[PDB]
């Protein structure tokens, strides 16, 4: 099992987050926050294209296809719902919540999410301040 658990999903999560912070999505920036080499990033992104999940634009910025964006959104949703579960119910020290959720986000089923929406007091945003996306699509 790779440290990122699901490589492709982590590249999409990265692109998503860069967008959230008004940062242009560049392969160069993915390598930086995921601590992966350039060729490695270049190869993965290349595969994501043939898979139809992202497009390397003329300016070389990364443009997620609608299907790429749907998957990325669901990964963010699972992560933030996990972060909420880990904080609100399990009581995991906040300093460990991000890394834990970073792994769980890749194995959480839509079904468990639905349950978390019903059990959690509120799913407006994650414990770190960001809005929990895709709630309406969840289903």
Residues near Ni ion (CB under 5 A): 10, 102
**Both structure tokens of 113:** 């999410």
Nearest approach in angstroms of CB 106 to a second copy is 6
Of the candidates 9, 47, 13, 15, the one whose C-alpha atom is nearest the C-alpha of residue 28 is 15
The listed partner (Ni ion, a second copy, none) that binds 11, CB under 5 to 8 Å by sort, is: none
Q: Candidates 31-39, 57-65, 103-111, 126-134: pick the segment binding a second copy (CB under 8 A).
A: 103-111
Among 43, 67, 107, 137, binds a second copy (CB under 8 A): 107
Answer positive or negative: Cα dihedral of 117, 137, 19, 12. positive
Q: Candidates 13-21, 43-51, 102-110, 123-131: pick the segment binding a second copy (CB under 8 A).
A: 102-110
Using rule CB under 8 A, residue 115 touches a second copy: yes
Give the nearer residue to a second copy in terms of CB position, either 103 or 125: 103
Report how far Cα 42 is from the mean position of its chain's Cα atoms. Answer: 19
Residue 91: what are its φ and ψ, rounded to 5°? 75, 25
The DSSP H or E segment spanning 100 is helix 94-104
Give the nearer residue to a second copy in terms of CB position, either 47 or 96: 96
**Both structure tokens of 18:** 């860069």
Q: Candidates 1-9, 11-19, 29-37, 61-69: pick the segment binding a second copy (CB under 8 A).
A: 1-9
Q: What angle do CA 32, 83, 103 make, to 5 degrees?
A: 55
């Amino acid at each position: 099992m790779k440290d990122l658990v699901d490589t492709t999903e982590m590249y999409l999560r990265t692109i998503y987050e860069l967008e959230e912070e008004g940062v242009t999505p560049l392969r160069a920036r993915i390598a930086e926050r995921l601590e992966q080499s350039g060729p490695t990033v270049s190869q993965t992104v290349a595969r994501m294209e043939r898979d139809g999940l992202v497009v390397v634009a003329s300016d070389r910025s990364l443009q997620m296809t609608p299907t790429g964006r749907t998957l990325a959104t669901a990964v963010m949703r699972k992560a933030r719902l996990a972060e909420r579960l880990l904080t609100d119910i399990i009581g995991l020290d906040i300093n460990k919540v991000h890394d834990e959720a970073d792994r769980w986000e890749h194995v959480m089923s839509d079904e468990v999410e639905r349950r978390l929406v019903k059990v959690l007091k509120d799913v407006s945003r994650s414990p770190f301040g960001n809005p929990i996306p895709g709630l309406d699509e969840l289903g």
